[PDB]
Amino acid sequence: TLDSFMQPFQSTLWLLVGLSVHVVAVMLYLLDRFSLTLSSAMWFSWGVLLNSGIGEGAPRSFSARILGMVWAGFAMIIVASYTANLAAFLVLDRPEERITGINDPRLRNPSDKFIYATVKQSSVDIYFRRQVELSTMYRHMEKHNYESAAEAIQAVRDNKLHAFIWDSAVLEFEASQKCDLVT
Amino acid sequence: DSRSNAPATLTFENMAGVFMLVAGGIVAGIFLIFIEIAYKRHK
Amino acid sequence: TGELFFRSGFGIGMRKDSPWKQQVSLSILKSHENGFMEDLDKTWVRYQECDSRSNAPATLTFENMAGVFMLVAGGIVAGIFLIFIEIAYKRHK
Amino acid sequence: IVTIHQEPFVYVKPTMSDGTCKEEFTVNGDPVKKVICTGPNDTSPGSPRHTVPQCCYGFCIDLLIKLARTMQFTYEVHLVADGKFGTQERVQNSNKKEWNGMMGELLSGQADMIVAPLTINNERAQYIEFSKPFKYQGLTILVKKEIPRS
Amino acid sequence: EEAPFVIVESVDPLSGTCMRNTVPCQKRIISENKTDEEPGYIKKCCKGFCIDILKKISKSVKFTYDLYLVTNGKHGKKINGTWNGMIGEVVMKRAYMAVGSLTINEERSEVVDFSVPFIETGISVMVSRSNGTVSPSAFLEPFSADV
Amino acid sequence: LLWGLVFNNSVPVQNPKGTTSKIMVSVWAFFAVIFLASYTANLAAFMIQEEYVDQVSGLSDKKFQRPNDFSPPFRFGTVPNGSTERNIRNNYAEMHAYMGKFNQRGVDDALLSLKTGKLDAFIYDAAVLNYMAGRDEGCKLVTIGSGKVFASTGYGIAIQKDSGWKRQVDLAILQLFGDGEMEELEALWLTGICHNEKNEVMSSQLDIDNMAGVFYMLGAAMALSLITFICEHLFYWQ
Amino acid sequence: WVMMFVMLLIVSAVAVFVFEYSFTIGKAIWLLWGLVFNNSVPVQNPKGTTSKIMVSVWAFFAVIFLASYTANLAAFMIQ
Numbered sequence: 001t002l003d004s005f006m007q008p009f010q011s012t013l014w015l016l017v018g019l020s021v022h023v024v025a026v027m028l029y030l031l032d033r034f035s036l037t038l039s040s041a042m043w044f045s046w047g048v049l050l051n052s053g054i055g056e057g058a059p060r061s062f063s064a065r066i067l068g069m070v071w072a073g074f075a076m077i078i079v080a081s082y083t084a085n086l087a088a089f090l091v092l093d094r095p096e097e098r099i100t101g102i103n104d105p106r107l108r109n110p111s112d113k114f115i116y117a118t119v120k121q122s123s124v125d126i127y128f129r130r131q132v133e134l135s136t137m138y139r140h141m142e143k144h145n146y147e148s149a150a151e152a153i154q155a156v157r158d159n160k161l162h163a164f165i166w167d168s169a170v171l172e173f174e175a176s177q178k179c180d181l182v183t
Numbered sequence: 184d185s186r187s188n189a190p191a192t193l194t195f196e197n198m199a200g201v202f203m204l205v206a207g208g209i210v211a212g213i214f215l216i217f218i219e220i221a222y223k224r225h226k
Numbered sequence: 227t228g229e230l231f232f233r234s235g236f237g238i239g240m241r242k243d244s245p246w247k248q249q250v251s252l253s254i255l256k257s258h259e260n261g262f263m264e265d266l267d268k269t270w271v272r273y274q275e276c277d278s279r280s281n282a283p284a285t286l287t288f289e290n291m292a293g294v295f296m297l298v299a300g301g302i303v304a305g306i307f308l309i310f311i312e313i314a315y316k317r318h319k
Numbered sequence: 320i321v322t323i324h325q326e327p328f329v330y331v332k333p334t335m336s337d338g339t340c341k342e343e344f345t346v347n348g349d350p351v352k353k354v355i356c357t358g359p360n361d362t363s364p365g366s367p368r369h370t371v372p373q374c375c376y377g378f379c380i381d382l383l384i385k386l387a388r389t390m391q392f393t394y395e396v397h398l399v400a401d402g403k404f405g406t407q408e409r410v411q412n413s414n415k416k417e418w419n420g421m422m423g424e425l426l427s428g429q430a431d432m433i434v435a436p437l438t439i440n441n442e443r444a445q446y447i448e449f450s451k452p453f454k455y456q457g458l459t460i461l462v463k464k465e466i467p468r469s
Numbered sequence: 470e471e472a473p474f475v476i477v478e479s480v481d482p483l484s485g486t487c488m489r490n491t492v493p494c495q496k497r498i499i500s501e502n503k504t505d506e507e508p509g510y511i512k513k514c515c516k517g518f519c520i521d522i523l524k525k526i527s528k529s530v531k532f533t534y535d536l537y538l539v540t541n542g543k544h545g546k547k548i549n550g551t552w553n554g555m556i557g558e559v560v561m562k563r564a565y566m567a568v569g570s571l572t573i574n575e576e577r578s579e580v581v582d583f584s585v586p587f588i589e590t591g592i593s594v595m596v597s598r599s600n601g602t603v604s605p606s607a608f609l610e611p612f613s614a615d616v
Numbered sequence: 617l618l619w620g621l622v623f624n625n626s627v628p629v630q631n632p633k634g635t636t637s638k639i640m641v642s643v644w645a646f647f648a649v650i651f652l653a654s655y656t657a658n659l660a661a662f663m664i665q666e667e668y669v670d671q672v673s674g675l676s677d678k679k680f681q682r683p684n685d686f687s688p689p690f691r692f693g694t695v696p697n698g699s700t701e702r703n704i705r706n707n708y709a710e711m712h713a714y715m716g717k718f719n720q721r722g723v724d725d726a727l728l729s730l731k732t733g734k735l736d737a738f739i740y741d742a743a744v745l746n747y748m749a750g751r752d753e754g755c756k757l758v759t760i761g762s763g764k765v766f767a768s769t770g771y772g773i774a775i776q777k778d779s780g781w782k783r784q785v786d787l788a789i790l791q792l793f794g795d796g797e798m799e800e801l802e803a804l805w806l807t808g809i810c811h812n813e814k815n816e817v818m819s820s821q822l823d824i825d826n827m828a829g830v831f832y833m834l835g836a837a838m839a840l841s842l843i844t845f846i847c848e849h850l851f852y853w854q
Numbered sequence: 855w856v857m858m859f860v861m862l863l864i865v866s867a868v869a870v871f872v873f874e875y876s877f878t879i880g881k882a883i884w885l886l887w888g889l890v891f892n893n894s895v896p897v898q899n900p901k902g903t904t905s906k907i908m909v910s911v912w913a914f915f916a917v918i919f920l921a922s923y924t925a926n927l928a929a930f931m932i933q
């Protein structure tokens with residue numbers, strides 16, 4: 001969603017930094033006449049954060065010559081944290097799950113919120129209705145099987161089926177021509 | 184082609200929000216430059 | 227490295243015809259519900275002196291990037307050895 | 320009582336020249352409870368077959384004191400001779416079989432209890448009585464890690 | 470009944486019995502209030518983690534059994550000197566043994582006789598993982614004050 | 617000039633004269649480019665390999681003993697008529713009453729209340745909560761720390777007192793433990809989906825909670841600057 | 855690149871228009887091109903309130919554009 005201005009920093013941080021720039025600006029003005037012009041304080045305090053050369057104002061008093069050095073050091077930390085935080089978005093993503101195969105907990109213990117089936121009268125049916133460790137998976141699969149391999153793939157596209165078990169020679173061909181499925 | 188990391192290059196509309204800021208500031212600035220021009224006449 | 231297998235606990239071995247075999251099992255279960263075996267665990271078994279990790283983000287130290295400090299000093303000493311040559315350059319050339 | 324040398328459970332340190340065990344405190348200034356152990360010498364009971372008093376303290380030593388105060392009995396802890404936990408073997412190729420270590424010393428009559436991290440299995444449960452488990456753990460593998468190079 | 474240990478379901482409406490790899494369990498139902506209803510039970514199917522252990526025990530040591538469900542209370546509680554649930558049923562002898570998620574404790578070990586434990590448990594606290602993290606000095610995590 | 621040149625040259629500065637000045641500043645400028653580039657890279661590595669922390673430390677925390685001394689009080693409770701309630705009642709009275717004024721009715725209702733913000737913590741058995749944390753729509757729910765019990769115990773079979781089948785049942789259970797059937801049973805029934813390695817959730821706020829150190833440093837710096845100012849003023853006045 | 859170059863030319867034209875209220879188009883385009891590739895090149899700044907605000911808003915554009923480029927490039931080298 002690339003919220004350029006709102007993604008790295010929160011809405012409360014953009015307003016706190018924008019208000020602190022005026023605190024240091026007027027402070028340099030008070031530190032000059034007590035030992036710069038109303039306009040010098042405005043650019044010089046903004047000429048270090050925005051990284052632009054505007055004006056020729058500089059603190060002459062020794063008391064203001066140290067506030068400016070910490071002011072300069074505060075802008076580098078924000079920019080360094082801005083780039084470092086933005087680099088965390090494009091490298092770290094949400095942990096996906098995706099069925100690990102036939103030994104997945106969602107298939108060994110089926111429920112009413114995950115549906116998976118195959119084509120009826122094929123050699124996938126014979127493989128499941130023959131072993132006794134696959135007895136609990138066959139009963140849940142028998143009540144959802146389809147008629148052909150062209151109707152079950154469309155069901156996955158319309159979000160009415162969850163998983164479809166078929167030959168790898170055919171399922172790796174639809175995953176290459178239809179960019180919205182994966183094996 | 185499929186992938187898992189999929190390094191995506193940012194497009195024009197991807198970062199179009201930053202382009203809007205310069206244009207907005209420039210139009211407000213003339214609407215503000217005229218006020219600034221009138222500021223030197225009245226004040 | 228790895229997970230746990232053959233999970234069995236420790237016990238107190240006593241002979242079959244022992245009169246004390248009933249009063250010991252009623253004292254271990256009582257010391258697990260009042261917090262008696264967690265003082266014995268945090269005193270002998272749980273002061274973890276050296277922390278482990280996998281990523282281990284390491285902060286760079288002085289000697290870690292000491293090669294960059296050497297460059298400024300080297301240039302400065304060569305520069306005076308070169309500033310004298312530069313001073314003599316203005317006299318001879 | 321019979322114990323075995325285990326670092327997280329039973330510490331075995333020699334006595335001083337006086338005969339008692341030196342005092343020691345923890346990080347919070349409370350005294351550590353020790354007891355007078357009596358087992359084999361430093362190396363082994365093979366050539367120097369003699370016993371010398373030692374000092375015992377650890378996780379399984381302060382637990383026996385709590386049982387001795389609640390059940391109101393007296394104890395006399397000593398160390399196993401051969402230094403093994405216990406297994407059933409064959410003796411001189413005979414029809415009978417026997418145990419060794421801490422498991423063969425209790426059945427012989429030389430002991431009454433076993434306060435040690437002894438694993439509850441099926442082979443040992445057919446001859447003795449174990450109580451409720453006082454520590455849940457398992458088996459794992461210990462290896463040596465590598466050093467990274469930047 | 471528990472979530473991972475004892476799962477209760479219904480019989481097959483086609484044949485009127487339970488599927489395979491399960492155990493037929495029978496719970497009683499009381500509907501009438503003004504009059505006392507004759508003993509009438511239903512037929513359910515029980516399975517899970519403890520049921521397989523019970524099957525293996527019954528295959529190891531030869532004996533027969535007939536499961537059923539508790540209806541008096543839950544796991545066991547002592548109310549005014551009387552135990553409810555599975556603890557109370559074993560105590561007034563209608564049950565012989567109780568299997569499920571019964572934890573060994575000192576108060577129950579004086580009226581019954583527990584067996585070796587087959588799984589470890591205890592007390593824990595579950596909280597929802599918030600979107601926050603811990604990084605108060607992330608700007609000081611780089612080069613220390615020496616450099 | 618030499619202080620500005622290493623924090624991104626931004627401040628207006630004047631450069632020296634002659635060959636000597638120019639070469640000294642150029643070598644110092646190369647120092648600045650390398651020092652600044654490795655700082656951003658190291659900081660990026662720390663944010664990518666960071667790690668979260670638990671909210672509480674256990675049942676002996678200040679939030680469980682003194683709930684009224686904070687923000688709107690912490691909400692925790694359990695289901696009565698069990699063993700955990702009997703354990704809490706004998707060890708903590710005020711906490712028992714406070715958690716009993718927040719009673720529940722089941723595990724699913726407790727999970728719903730925890731997901732809908734109606735509850736902050738739920739105390740129940742260890743295996744049940746581990747199973748509920750390892751089997752969830754997403755991985756929002758978690759256990760404090762990394763999985764830890766406070767009252768170690770186990771599940772057993774309740775038989776009548778002074779029976780003859782207890783020894784046989786114990787021997788059969790130990791034989792099943794020694795053969796390896798418990799591992800198969802736990803892999804078949806006690807498997808999980810969530811609870812993987814605790815990586816970063818890729819936080820997207822960096823709010824005032826994390827960025828308070830720079831503001832504290834700026835406050836200390838301006839306070840020290842004002843102190844030096846008043847000290848120099850008092851010294852010049854005398 | 856061209857989408858920002860056209861806006862660069864637009865900003866240059868706006869600065870030329872503001873100059874009515876020695877600042878030619880060459881120095882303008884030079885400053886406005888240097889300001890986004892790390893200001894390094896010696897440049898001269900304009901005068902008055904209008905010039906200063908136009909350059910400051912353009913300078914904020916440069917900081918955001920440059921920071922997301924290094925971050926995106928780092929993501930490509932890591933994956």
Ligand SMILES: *[C@@H]1O[C@H](CO)[C@@H](O[C@@H]2O[C@H](CO)[C@@H](O)[C@H](O)[C@H]2NC(C)=O)[C@H](O)[C@H]1NC(C)=O
Binds near residue numbers: 696
């Ligand atoms: C815990 O046990 C108590 C029994 O003391 C249950 O309280 C009763 O709840 C039932 C169900 O509505 C009522 O019919 C009774 O009249 C209640 N009796 C009393 C004395 O309050 C309580 O519901 C149980 N709680 C849980 C969560 O199982």
Ligand SMILES: *[C@@H]1O[C@H](CO)[C@@H](O)[C@H](O)[C@H]1NC(C)=O
Binds near residue numbers: 549550
């Ligand atoms: C408790 O004691 C007996 C039953 O155990 C009964 O007579 C008495 O009325 C009960 N009282 C209460 C308050 O439950």
Ligand SMILES: N[C@@H](CCC(=O)O)C(=O)O
Binds near residue numbers: 545572697698741
């Ligand atoms: N296992 C408990 C019930 C569940 C719990 O309290 O966590 C009992 O039998 O009392």
